[PDB]
Amino acid sequence: RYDSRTTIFSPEGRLYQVEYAMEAIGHAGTCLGILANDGVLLAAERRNIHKLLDEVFFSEKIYKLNEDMACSVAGITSDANVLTNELRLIAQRYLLQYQEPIPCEQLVTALCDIKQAYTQFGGKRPFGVSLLYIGWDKHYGFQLYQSDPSGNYGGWKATCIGNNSAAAVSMLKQDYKEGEMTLKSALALAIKVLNKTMDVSKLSAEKVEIATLTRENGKTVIRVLKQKEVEQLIKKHEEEEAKAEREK
Amino acid sequence: SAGFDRHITIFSPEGRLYQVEYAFKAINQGGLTSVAVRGKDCAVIVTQKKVPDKLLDSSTVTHLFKITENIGCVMTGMTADSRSQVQRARYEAANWKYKYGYEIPVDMLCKRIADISQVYTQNAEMRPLGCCMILIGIDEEQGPQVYKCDPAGYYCGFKATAAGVKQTESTSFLEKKVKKKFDWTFEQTVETAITCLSTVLSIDFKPSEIEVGVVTVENPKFRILTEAEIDAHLVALAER
Amino acid sequence: IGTGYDLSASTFSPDGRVFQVEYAMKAVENSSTAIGIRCKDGVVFGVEKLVLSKLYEEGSNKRLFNVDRHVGMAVAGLLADARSLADIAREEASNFRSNFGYNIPLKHLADRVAMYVHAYTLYSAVRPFGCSFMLGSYSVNDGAQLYMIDPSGVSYGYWGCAIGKARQAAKTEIEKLQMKEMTCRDIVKEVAKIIYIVHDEVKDKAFELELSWVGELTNGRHEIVPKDIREEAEKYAKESLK
Amino acid sequence: ERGYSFSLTTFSPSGKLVQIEYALAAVAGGAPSVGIKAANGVVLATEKKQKSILYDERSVHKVEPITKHIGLVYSGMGPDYRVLVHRARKLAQQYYLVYQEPIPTAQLVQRVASVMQEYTQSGGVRPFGVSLLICGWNEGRPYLFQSDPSGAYFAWKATAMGKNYVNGKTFLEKRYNEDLELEDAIHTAILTLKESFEGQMTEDNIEVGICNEAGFRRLTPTEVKDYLAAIA
Amino acid sequence: ELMPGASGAEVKGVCTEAGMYALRERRVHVTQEDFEMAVAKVMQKDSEKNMSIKKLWK
Amino acid sequence: SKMNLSEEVDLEDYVARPDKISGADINSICQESGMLAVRENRYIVLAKDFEKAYKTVIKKDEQEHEFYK
C-alpha cells in the first residue's frame, strides 16, 4: 500500500504518514487556550503524575519561548523538546537580526515551515507534535495560534488539542462569547472545559497546568498559576457548580 | 515474533538484537578454541592449532598476536575479521601512545575497541566483525589483567576466560578450578590452561598443535612461548 | 540453503556465516587451476589458462601479474576482479615504497591486500572480490615466501598451494612431491607436469601453460619463464605425461 | 501492524513508532536498578550479578560519575551505556568549558536526552537500548532524573527500572517517604534490590552510588558490605 | 460519579458485586462502602505499567 | 501429603526461596523428587534428591549474552 515513507502520495492524493501524525495527537495530553479581551491563557492537563514525580519544573506542557511568547505542547516528548528548542532559536535569531520581539505569525510560520520541510522531503518522519502558541504584539495585540504536525497553523480565539479535543472544542464553541470575556471568565471557562473533557469527577489542581499571558504597563508578563492560585480557582468553580446544581 | 533478524540496527520485539547473537555464533564458526588464565603475577593465553596439511607454513598460521611490546592478544572466529581487529587494536594502541605519552592499559584498550564494536553494531553500515578478542598484560598498582572483547562491544575482566566452540565446557572447567582458591603460580597457570584445553577436547595433544603467550611482571614484554618452552611445560605436565 | 540471509555481505546466518563470502568461495572453486611452489631460493608459479577460442592471441588475459619488481602475482577466479586486486596491490606497494623507502615485504603486502579484500567483504554496498590470488617473492635478507589470499580475506602462508577446480587433486599430487630441497630448476618441471595432469582433456580442453618465478636466478626479480626454459619444461611435461 | 514495526521514520497508523517501544522492551529486560531521592541526597543502586565468578567485578562499573556531583546508572545494554557515559561526560565538560561552572543536572539531562533522541531521528541507526538514571545535587536540592531511549526525560522521587521493575516500583511507593534520610534511603534501595535479587546480595554482587552536598561518590565495597550487614 | 465512562452493563455488575459483598458477610442490606469496593472491583483494568512507555507522549 | 515423610527437610525454606514458579512447577518438583527416589532405590526422600529435583525443575537456564543486561 501507500503507507511507506512520508514522501509518497496515495492515488486519491492523501499523505497517509501525515494523516497518522495528525491522528497521533489524540493520544497526547489535553491542552487548550482561550483568547480574552485583556489577556490570554493556556490550560493543559498533566496526564502522567503517578506518585513519585519530583515536579522539579516550571511547566511541562507549557513552554516559554520569548519574553512575549509562550506555547503548549502535545505530542512525542523528543519532538516536543526539539521543536521548543528550535522555537527559542528562531525567536532569538529574529531578535538579534531585527532588535525587536518576533511577531506571533512570523514565528509560527517559521516553525510550520520547518515542520513542512520535515514532511516535504528527506525520508524523515514528520514531527508528531501540535502546538498552541500564546503571545502579544503591537501588530495584533493578543493572538492565539494552533499549530499542526502537517505544518499548517491557524489563528484561533479558543482551541483544544489532545485527547477528547473534539468534544472539548465543540462545547467550547457552544459556550464562547467572543469579544466579551475577561481573564476571570476565560479561566472559569477553561476549568469547566477541563472538567467536562477529563476522566475525573473532581479534577485536582495537580492534573491541571495553566499559564496566563497579560500585557500591562509597557511589558508582557507570562506567569503560570501557582498551586494556591489554581486551587483557589478550581474551588471557586466547584462552588459555582454547586450553586448551579442546587439552583436547578 | 521472528523476521527481525535481517538488519543489525533493527530491534526485535522483547528488545532482542538477533544479528549480534548471529555474530556471536559466527565466533564459534571458526572451529577453534582458546583459553586464558591469570595468576598472581602472570597471564597465559593458549589456543588450539589445526593444520589440514603439512603444505601450510606453520609459522604464519598463528592465532595470537602482539598489540604492543607488552600487551598480547589472542582471538578466535573468522580469521580475516581477527586480523582486521588486531590491525585496529595496534592502530588504537599507538595512537593512544602518541596522544597521551604512555603505554595503553589493557582495560582502556579493551574499552576503546569495544566502543568501536558498539559503534559498528549501532549503525547498519557495518558487519560487526564477528570475532572474539582476549588481551593480557601487566599494569602497575594492579598486576596482570585478562580482558575479553566481543562483537557486541561488551568487555569485562576475567580471572580466567575462554573462547571458541568449547566455550561452555571450558568455562565450567575453569569454574571448577577457580573455586578451589589457589595461588596459580606461572607454571601452574600454564598447566591449568593446558589441562583445560586437553580435557575439553579429550585429545591429549602433541606439543606441535599449540601456541602459548604469557606476560609476567618480571617479563612485561609479551613473550610468545617458543616450541622448546611449550615442550618443556606440557611434557613436564604429562609426567607430573 | 540460507535464503533471506545471503542477499548481502553484512548479514549473518543462524549458523553464523556470511553466505556471500561462501558464494565467492564457490566462484573461485568453479574457475581455472593455478599452482605455485616456493623453492630453496625463490618461488615459481603455474597457471592453467584455458584458451576459450583459438581466435585469442597467445598471452591474452595474462593471469600472472607482477605487483612489484620482486613480488609475483598468480590469481584465479574472475579476471576483472583479479585485475582490480592486482591494481590495488600495485598501488599499495608503490605507496609503501614512497613512504618507507624500501621494498615491501611479502608478508606485509599480503597483510595489507588481505585487509583491503576483507574491507570489501563486510559492507553491504559492495561485493567481495570473487577471486583467490597468490603472492610470491624472494629477498636475500628475508628469504622466499608464498601466500594465498582468498575472498574470505584470510592470508595464510603455504609451502606450495593451488587454487581452482582442481584444489583437492593438486593437493594430493603436490603432497607426494617433496618440496623443501631443490631450486627452481628442479621444480619448474614438476610444476609443469602437475598442471598437465590436473587438467582434464575429455571436458574443458584447449588450455595453455604459462609459468613465472622470482629468485636469485633472476636477481630476485619476478618475470615470466624464459622461452628456452618454458619449452624444456614443456618437453619434460610431455615425456613425463607419456 | 507488522509493516510499521521495522523503521524508525514511519508512523504506525494507530499509534507511534514501534522501534522505540522495542528498545524500551530491551531496557525492561536489563539488570534491575533503583534510584531514591532522600531529603539531603540521592542514592542509586544496581545489581552486578553475573555467572562465572571468573569475571573480575572490579573491571567494569555500572555506576559511573559524570562530574564531581553527577552520577548515572543504566538498565539495559552495557555497551550502549558506555557510549552514553562518554557522550554525557563530553557534554558536561563542554558546558564547563563554556560557562566555567559545574553543569546543573537538569541541563545535563536535557542534553543527554537530546543525544539519545538524535539516534531516533533517522533509519539505519538504532535507538539506545538503555534507560539512564541521573542523580545530582545542586542549588541546595538533590535531583533524580530518568533518561529514555525515546529522548523523553522526567524526574523521579524514587523509581526502579529493568527486570522486575513493576514490583520494585510498588515496593518503592509503599516504602518511600518525602522526609527520608540518606542512610534509610540506601537501606530502602538495597531492600528493593533484595526482594527480586535471587541470590543473596554480597558486597560485590550489588553496586551503589550516593550523591549529596559533598558531590557524587560511588560507595566502596567496604561500605556496601557494612550496609548489607546492617540490613542483614 | 465514581464510574467515569462506564457502560450500563458495568453499572449492573457494580450493583451485583455490591450485593455479593453484602452476601459474603451474611447480611441483606448494602452500604455505601460496599458500592465503593464494587465499583473498584468491577472497573478494575490493567493500565500501562511501564511509566517510560506512558511518558512517550507529552 | 500423599508423599512419604521428608525426614525433616526445610520445606519452609524451599517455600521461602523467591522463585516465580507455578503450582504446576511445585507438582513437578515433588514428582521429580519421587522419580529420583525411585531411581536411587530409597522410598524416603531427603534433601539431596529433593534439592536435585528443585534445580532440575526451576532451572530457568538463560546463557543470555552479557551485552543484553
PDB file of C-alpha atoms in Angstrom, chain D:
ATOM      1  CA  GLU D   1       0.849  -3.501  12.317  1.00  0.00           C
ATOM      2  CA  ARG D   2       3.876  -5.591  11.365  1.00  0.00           C
ATOM      3  CA  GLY D   3       4.988  -3.399   8.457  1.00  0.00           C
ATOM      4  CA  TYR D   4       5.335  -0.422  10.811  1.00  0.00           C
ATOM      5  CA  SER D   5       7.482  -2.239  13.406  1.00  0.00           C
ATOM      6  CA  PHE D   6      10.526  -2.162  11.125  1.00  0.00           C
ATOM      7  CA  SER D   7      11.515   1.500  10.662  1.00  0.00           C
ATOM      8  CA  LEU D   8      12.116   4.480  12.925  1.00  0.00           C
ATOM      9  CA  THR D   9      10.857   7.040  10.377  1.00  0.00           C
ATOM     10  CA  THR D  10       7.367   5.618   9.721  1.00  0.00           C
ATOM     11  CA  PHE D  11       4.324   6.216  11.908  1.00  0.00           C
ATOM     12  CA  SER D  12       2.111   3.283  12.774  1.00  0.00           C
ATOM     13  CA  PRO D  13      -1.436   4.055  11.565  1.00  0.00           C
ATOM     14  CA  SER D  14      -2.890   3.877  15.080  1.00  0.00           C
ATOM     15  CA  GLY D  15      -0.130   4.999  17.426  1.00  0.00           C
ATOM     16  CA  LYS D  16       3.537   5.897  17.112  1.00  0.00           C
ATOM     17  CA  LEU D  17       6.952   4.399  16.402  1.00  0.00           C
ATOM     18  CA  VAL D  18       7.220   0.745  17.386  1.00  0.00           C
ATOM     19  CA  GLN D  19      11.025   0.512  17.348  1.00  0.00           C
ATOM     20  CA  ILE D  20      11.091   2.940  20.278  1.00  0.00           C
ATOM     21  CA  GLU D  21       8.806   0.609  22.226  1.00  0.00           C
ATOM     22  CA  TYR D  22      11.018  -2.336  21.281  1.00  0.00           C
ATOM     23  CA  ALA D  23      14.095  -0.510  22.572  1.00  0.00           C
ATOM     24  CA  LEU D  24      12.125   0.167  25.752  1.00  0.00           C
ATOM     25  CA  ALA D  25      11.369  -3.556  25.971  1.00  0.00           C
ATOM     26  CA  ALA D  26      15.106  -4.187  25.675  1.00  0.00           C
ATOM     27  CA  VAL D  27      15.554  -1.732  28.548  1.00  0.00           C
ATOM     28  CA  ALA D  28      12.976  -3.602  30.634  1.00  0.00           C
ATOM     29  CA  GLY D  29      14.950  -6.824  30.196  1.00  0.00           C
ATOM     30  CA  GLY D  30      18.133  -5.391  31.681  1.00  0.00           C
ATOM     31  CA  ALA D  31      19.620  -5.730  35.127  1.00  0.00           C
ATOM     32  CA  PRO D  32      17.363  -4.283  37.854  1.00  0.00           C
ATOM     33  CA  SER D  33      18.345  -0.854  39.138  1.00  0.00           C
ATOM     34  CA  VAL D  34      16.732   1.535  41.618  1.00  0.00           C
ATOM     35  CA  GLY D  35      17.234   5.195  42.476  1.00  0.00           C
ATOM     36  CA  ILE D  36      15.940   7.014  45.546  1.00  0.00           C
ATOM     37  CA  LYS D  37      15.967  10.745  46.306  1.00  0.00           C
ATOM     38  CA  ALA D  38      16.359  11.421  50.021  1.00  0.00           C
ATOM     39  CA  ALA D  39      15.858  14.764  51.746  1.00  0.00           C
ATOM     40  CA  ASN D  40      19.581  15.601  51.776  1.00  0.00           C
ATOM     41  CA  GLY D  41      20.874  13.463  48.920  1.00  0.00           C
ATOM     42  CA  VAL D  42      20.232  10.859  46.255  1.00  0.00           C
ATOM     43  CA  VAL D  43      21.183   7.190  46.030  1.00  0.00           C
ATOM     44  CA  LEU D  44      21.054   4.781  43.098  1.00  0.00           C
ATOM     45  CA  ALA D  45      21.735   1.053  43.178  1.00  0.00           C
ATOM     46  CA  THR D  46      22.033  -1.828  40.735  1.00  0.00           C
ATOM     47  CA  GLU D  47      22.972  -5.499  40.827  1.00  0.00           C
ATOM     48  CA  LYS D  48      26.230  -6.713  39.277  1.00  0.00           C
ATOM     49  CA  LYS D  49      25.299 -10.397  39.476  1.00  0.00           C
ATOM     50  CA  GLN D  50      26.854 -12.469  36.709  1.00  0.00           C
ATOM     51  CA  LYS D  51      27.720 -16.139  36.419  1.00  0.00           C
ATOM     52  CA  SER D  52      31.294 -17.419  36.127  1.00  0.00           C
ATOM     53  CA  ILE D  53      32.917 -15.795  39.169  1.00  0.00           C
ATOM     54  CA  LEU D  54      35.961 -15.841  36.872  1.00  0.00           C
ATOM     55  CA  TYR D  55      34.580 -12.441  35.850  1.00  0.00           C
ATOM     56  CA  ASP D  56      36.528  -9.618  37.502  1.00  0.00           C
ATOM     57  CA  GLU D  57      33.819  -7.497  39.115  1.00  0.00           C
ATOM     58  CA  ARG D  58      36.198  -4.578  39.694  1.00  0.00           C
ATOM     59  CA  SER D  59      36.947  -4.341  35.960  1.00  0.00           C
ATOM     60  CA  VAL D  60      33.648  -2.721  34.936  1.00  0.00           C
ATOM     61  CA  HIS D  61      31.328  -0.465  36.920  1.00  0.00           C
ATOM     62  CA  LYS D  62      27.621   0.080  36.334  1.00  0.00           C
ATOM     63  CA  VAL D  63      27.712   3.271  38.433  1.00  0.00           C
ATOM     64  CA  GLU D  64      29.909   5.995  36.964  1.00  0.00           C
ATOM     65  CA  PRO D  65      30.393   9.693  37.741  1.00  0.00           C
ATOM     66  CA  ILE D  66      29.820  12.307  35.067  1.00  0.00           C
ATOM     67  CA  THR D  67      31.359  15.175  37.045  1.00  0.00           C
ATOM     68  CA  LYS D  68      32.138  15.987  40.678  1.00  0.00           C
ATOM     69  CA  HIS D  69      28.425  15.921  41.574  1.00  0.00           C
ATOM     70  CA  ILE D  70      26.600  13.910  38.856  1.00  0.00           C
ATOM     71  CA  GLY D  71      26.339  10.135  38.713  1.00  0.00           C
ATOM     72  CA  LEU D  72      24.396   7.825  36.450  1.00  0.00           C
ATOM     73  CA  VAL D  73      23.109   4.246  36.326  1.00  0.00           C
ATOM     74  CA  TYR D  74      21.585   2.300  33.442  1.00  0.00           C
ATOM     75  CA  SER D  75      19.267  -0.665  32.990  1.00  0.00           C
ATOM     76  CA  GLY D  76      19.691  -2.463  29.683  1.00  0.00           C
ATOM     77  CA  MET D  77      22.683  -2.857  27.389  1.00  0.00           C
ATOM     78  CA  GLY D  78      26.229  -2.425  28.608  1.00  0.00           C
ATOM     79  CA  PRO D  79      27.987  -1.009  25.539  1.00  0.00           C
ATOM     80  CA  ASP D  80      25.193   1.486  24.873  1.00  0.00           C
ATOM     81  CA  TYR D  81      25.536   2.592  28.488  1.00  0.00           C
ATOM     82  CA  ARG D  82      29.273   3.065  27.942  1.00  0.00           C
ATOM     83  CA  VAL D  83      28.622   5.196  24.858  1.00  0.00           C
ATOM     84  CA  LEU D  84      26.052   7.209  26.811  1.00  0.00           C
ATOM     85  CA  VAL D  85      28.592   7.741  29.594  1.00  0.00           C
ATOM     86  CA  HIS D  86      31.167   9.008  27.103  1.00  0.00           C
ATOM     87  CA  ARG D  87      28.652  11.351  25.468  1.00  0.00           C
ATOM     88  CA  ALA D  88      27.414  12.679  28.821  1.00  0.00           C
ATOM     89  CA  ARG D  89      30.967  13.307  30.026  1.00  0.00           C
ATOM     90  CA  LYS D  90      31.689  15.176  26.794  1.00  0.00           C
ATOM     91  CA  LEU D  91      28.564  17.330  27.166  1.00  0.00           C
ATOM     92  CA  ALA D  92      29.314  18.094  30.818  1.00  0.00           C
ATOM     93  CA  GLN D  93      32.887  19.098  30.013  1.00  0.00           C
ATOM     94  CA  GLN D  94      31.741  21.266  27.095  1.00  0.00           C
ATOM     95  CA  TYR D  95      29.265  23.034  29.380  1.00  0.00           C
ATOM     96  CA  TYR D  96      32.009  23.521  31.971  1.00  0.00           C
ATOM     97  CA  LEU D  97      34.386  24.914  29.348  1.00  0.00           C
ATOM     98  CA  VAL D  98      31.896  27.448  28.010  1.00  0.00           C
ATOM     99  CA  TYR D  99      30.310  28.518  31.323  1.00  0.00           C
ATOM    100  CA  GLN D 100      33.242  27.901  33.732  1.00  0.00           C
ATOM    101  CA  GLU D 101      30.714  26.477  36.196  1.00  0.00           C
ATOM    102  CA  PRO D 102      29.694  22.912  37.131  1.00  0.00           C
ATOM    103  CA  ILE D 103      26.860  21.767  34.903  1.00  0.00           C
ATOM    104  CA  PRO D 104      23.437  21.676  36.607  1.00  0.00           C
ATOM    105  CA  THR D 105      21.960  18.197  36.467  1.00  0.00           C
ATOM    106  CA  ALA D 106      18.781  19.386  34.732  1.00  0.00           C
ATOM    107  CA  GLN D 107      20.726  20.778  31.770  1.00  0.00           C
ATOM    108  CA  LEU D 108      22.819  17.605  31.637  1.00  0.00           C
ATOM    109  CA  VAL D 109      19.658  15.502  31.498  1.00  0.00           C
ATOM    110  CA  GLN D 110      18.230  17.667  28.713  1.00  0.00           C
ATOM    111  CA  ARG D 111      21.434  17.423  26.673  1.00  0.00           C
ATOM    112  CA  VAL D 112      21.834  13.673  27.178  1.00  0.00           C
ATOM    113  CA  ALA D 113      18.165  13.114  26.305  1.00  0.00           C
ATOM    114  CA  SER D 114      18.722  15.109  23.118  1.00  0.00           C
ATOM    115  CA  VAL D 115      21.752  12.922  22.396  1.00  0.00           C
ATOM    116  CA  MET D 116      19.714   9.739  22.831  1.00  0.00           C
ATOM    117  CA  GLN D 117      16.843  11.068  20.715  1.00  0.00           C
ATOM    118  CA  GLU D 118      19.234  12.083  17.927  1.00  0.00           C
ATOM    119  CA  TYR D 119      19.744   8.354  17.387  1.00  0.00           C
ATOM    120  CA  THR D 120      15.979   8.053  16.834  1.00  0.00           C
ATOM    121  CA  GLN D 121      15.841  10.686  14.080  1.00  0.00           C
ATOM    122  CA  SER D 122      16.632   8.525  11.053  1.00  0.00           C
ATOM    123  CA  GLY D 123      16.649   4.922   9.937  1.00  0.00           C
ATOM    124  CA  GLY D 124      19.805   2.893   9.613  1.00  0.00           C
ATOM    125  CA  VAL D 125      20.769   3.738  13.207  1.00  0.00           C
ATOM    126  CA  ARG D 126      19.086   2.105  16.159  1.00  0.00           C
ATOM    127  CA  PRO D 127      17.953   3.787  19.384  1.00  0.00           C
ATOM    128  CA  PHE D 128      19.954   3.137  22.520  1.00  0.00           C
ATOM    129  CA  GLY D 129      18.636   0.102  24.354  1.00  0.00           C
ATOM    130  CA  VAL D 130      19.480   1.811  27.635  1.00  0.00           C
ATOM    131  CA  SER D 131      17.487   3.866  30.130  1.00  0.00           C
ATOM    132  CA  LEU D 132      19.527   6.168  32.359  1.00  0.00           C
ATOM    133  CA  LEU D 133      19.103   7.250  35.971  1.00  0.00           C
ATOM    134  CA  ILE D 134      20.679  10.647  36.659  1.00  0.00           C
ATOM    135  CA  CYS D 135      21.491  11.638  40.237  1.00  0.00           C
ATOM    136  CA  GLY D 136      22.711  15.104  41.145  1.00  0.00           C
ATOM    137  CA  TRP D 137      22.929  17.746  43.850  1.00  0.00           C
ATOM    138  CA  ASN D 138      22.932  21.484  43.177  1.00  0.00           C
ATOM    139  CA  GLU D 139      21.270  24.673  44.426  1.00  0.00           C
ATOM    140  CA  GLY D 140      20.771  23.009  47.800  1.00  0.00           C
ATOM    141  CA  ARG D 141      18.495  20.386  46.270  1.00  0.00           C
ATOM    142  CA  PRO D 142      19.055  16.740  45.287  1.00  0.00           C
ATOM    143  CA  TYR D 143      17.779  15.838  41.813  1.00  0.00           C
ATOM    144  CA  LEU D 144      16.902  12.459  40.304  1.00  0.00           C
ATOM    145  CA  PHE D 145      16.053  12.057  36.619  1.00  0.00           C
ATOM    146  CA  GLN D 146      15.424   9.215  34.198  1.00  0.00           C
ATOM    147  CA  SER D 147      16.510   9.457  30.563  1.00  0.00           C
ATOM    148  CA  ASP D 148      14.779   7.313  27.984  1.00  0.00           C
ATOM    149  CA  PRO D 149      15.758   5.766  24.640  1.00  0.00           C
ATOM    150  CA  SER D 150      12.979   7.868  23.110  1.00  0.00           C
ATOM    151  CA  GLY D 151      14.676  11.033  24.353  1.00  0.00           C
ATOM    152  CA  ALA D 152      11.985  11.673  26.950  1.00  0.00           C
ATOM    153  CA  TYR D 153      13.386  12.785  30.294  1.00  0.00           C
ATOM    154  CA  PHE D 154      11.497  13.070  33.563  1.00  0.00           C
ATOM    155  CA  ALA D 155      12.205  13.378  37.264  1.00  0.00           C
ATOM    156  CA  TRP D 156      11.705  10.681  39.884  1.00  0.00           C
ATOM    157  CA  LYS D 157      11.336  10.799  43.653  1.00  0.00           C
ATOM    158  CA  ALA D 158      12.154   7.078  43.731  1.00  0.00           C
ATOM    159  CA  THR D 159      11.996   4.630  40.825  1.00  0.00           C
ATOM    160  CA  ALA D 160      13.294   1.248  39.724  1.00  0.00           C
ATOM    161  CA  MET D 161      13.566   0.047  36.130  1.00  0.00           C
ATOM    162  CA  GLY D 162      14.986  -3.046  34.496  1.00  0.00           C
ATOM    163  CA  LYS D 163      13.965  -6.589  35.269  1.00  0.00           C
ATOM    164  CA  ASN D 164      11.061  -6.800  37.734  1.00  0.00           C
ATOM    165  CA  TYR D 165      10.590  -3.032  37.619  1.00  0.00           C
ATOM    166  CA  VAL D 166       6.866  -3.177  38.431  1.00  0.00           C
ATOM    167  CA  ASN D 167       7.366  -4.924  41.777  1.00  0.00           C
ATOM    168  CA  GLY D 168      10.230  -2.579  42.594  1.00  0.00           C
ATOM    169  CA  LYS D 169       8.029   0.426  41.864  1.00  0.00           C
ATOM    170  CA  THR D 170       5.204  -0.954  44.012  1.00  0.00           C
ATOM    171  CA  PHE D 171       7.640  -1.555  46.871  1.00  0.00           C
ATOM    172  CA  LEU D 172       9.116   1.924  46.490  1.00  0.00           C
ATOM    173  CA  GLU D 173       5.722   3.625  46.512  1.00  0.00           C
ATOM    174  CA  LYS D 174       4.816   1.543  49.575  1.00  0.00           C
ATOM    175  CA  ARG D 175       8.118   2.466  51.286  1.00  0.00           C
ATOM    176  CA  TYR D 176       9.340   5.856  50.055  1.00  0.00           C
ATOM    177  CA  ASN D 177       8.531   8.953  52.100  1.00  0.00           C
ATOM    178  CA  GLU D 178       9.447  12.538  51.270  1.00  0.00           C
ATOM    179  CA  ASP D 179      11.171  13.080  54.645  1.00  0.00           C
ATOM    180  CA  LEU D 180      13.524  10.134  54.102  1.00  0.00           C
ATOM    181  CA  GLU D 181      17.140  10.307  55.248  1.00  0.00           C
ATOM    182  CA  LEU D 182      20.153   9.317  53.166  1.00  0.00           C
ATOM    183  CA  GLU D 183      21.044   6.227  55.206  1.00  0.00           C
ATOM    184  CA  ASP D 184      17.456   4.988  55.234  1.00  0.00           C
ATOM    185  CA  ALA D 185      17.330   5.820  51.519  1.00  0.00           C
ATOM    186  CA  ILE D 186      20.283   3.495  50.903  1.00  0.00           C
ATOM    187  CA  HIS D 187      18.609   0.871  53.088  1.00  0.00           C
ATOM    188  CA  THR D 188      15.399   1.107  51.052  1.00  0.00           C
ATOM    189  CA  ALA D 189      17.327   0.908  47.774  1.00  0.00           C
ATOM    190  CA  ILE D 190      19.198  -2.184  48.963  1.00  0.00           C
ATOM    191  CA  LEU D 191      15.942  -3.811  50.092  1.00  0.00           C
ATOM    192  CA  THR D 192      14.354  -3.024  46.719  1.00  0.00           C
ATOM    193  CA  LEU D 193      17.290  -4.778  45.079  1.00  0.00           C
ATOM    194  CA  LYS D 194      16.967  -7.662  47.543  1.00  0.00           C
ATOM    195  CA  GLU D 195      13.309  -8.515  47.022  1.00  0.00           C
ATOM    196  CA  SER D 196      13.980  -9.586  43.416  1.00  0.00           C
ATOM    197  CA  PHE D 197      17.736 -10.218  43.586  1.00  0.00           C
ATOM    198  CA  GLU D 198      17.539 -14.046  43.541  1.00  0.00           C
ATOM    199  CA  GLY D 199      20.819 -14.972  45.174  1.00  0.00           C
ATOM    200  CA  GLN D 200      21.730 -13.245  48.454  1.00  0.00           C
ATOM    201  CA  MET D 201      23.481  -9.995  47.523  1.00  0.00           C
ATOM    202  CA  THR D 202      27.146  -9.890  48.501  1.00  0.00           C
ATOM    203  CA  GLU D 203      29.449  -6.896  48.897  1.00  0.00           C
ATOM    204  CA  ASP D 204      30.261  -7.048  45.171  1.00  0.00           C
ATOM    205  CA  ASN D 205      27.020  -8.516  43.792  1.00  0.00           C
ATOM    206  CA  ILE D 206      25.440  -5.054  44.004  1.00  0.00           C
ATOM    207  CA  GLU D 207      26.871  -1.654  43.123  1.00  0.00           C
ATOM    208  CA  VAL D 208      25.534   1.535  44.716  1.00  0.00           C
ATOM    209  CA  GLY D 209      26.438   5.208  44.468  1.00  0.00           C
ATOM    210  CA  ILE D 210      25.426   8.188  46.581  1.00  0.00           C
ATOM    211  CA  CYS D 211      25.330  11.921  45.895  1.00  0.00           C
ATOM    212  CA  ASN D 212      24.844  14.797  48.319  1.00  0.00           C
ATOM    213  CA  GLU D 213      26.148  18.283  49.103  1.00  0.00           C
ATOM    214  CA  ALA D 214      29.613  16.661  49.090  1.00  0.00           C
ATOM    215  CA  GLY D 215      29.262  15.561  45.468  1.00  0.00           C
ATOM    216  CA  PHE D 216      28.628  12.151  43.956  1.00  0.00           C
ATOM    217  CA  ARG D 217      30.681   9.179  45.121  1.00  0.00           C
ATOM    218  CA  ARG D 218      30.302   5.518  44.248  1.00  0.00           C
ATOM    219  CA  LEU D 219      30.367   3.572  47.501  1.00  0.00           C
ATOM    220  CA  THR D 220      33.397   1.383  48.097  1.00  0.00           C
ATOM    221  CA  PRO D 221      32.788  -2.352  48.611  1.00  0.00           C
ATOM    222  CA  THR D 222      33.574  -1.987  52.325  1.00  0.00           C
ATOM    223  CA  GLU D 223      30.715   0.466  52.870  1.00  0.00           C
ATOM    224  CA  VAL D 224      28.435  -1.729  50.753  1.00  0.00           C
ATOM    225  CA  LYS D 225      29.284  -4.700  52.976  1.00  0.00           C
ATOM    226  CA  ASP D 226      28.649  -2.603  56.093  1.00  0.00           C
ATOM    227  CA  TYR D 227      25.246  -1.503  54.792  1.00  0.00           C
ATOM    228  CA  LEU D 228      24.423  -5.107  53.878  1.00  0.00           C
ATOM    229  CA  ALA D 229      25.355  -6.275  57.376  1.00  0.00           C
ATOM    230  CA  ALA D 230      23.223  -3.507  58.890  1.00  0.00           C
ATOM    231  CA  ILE D 231      20.271  -4.538  56.717  1.00  0.00           C
ATOM    232  CA  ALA D 232      21.090  -8.263  57.045  1.00  0.00           C
TER     233      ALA D 232
END
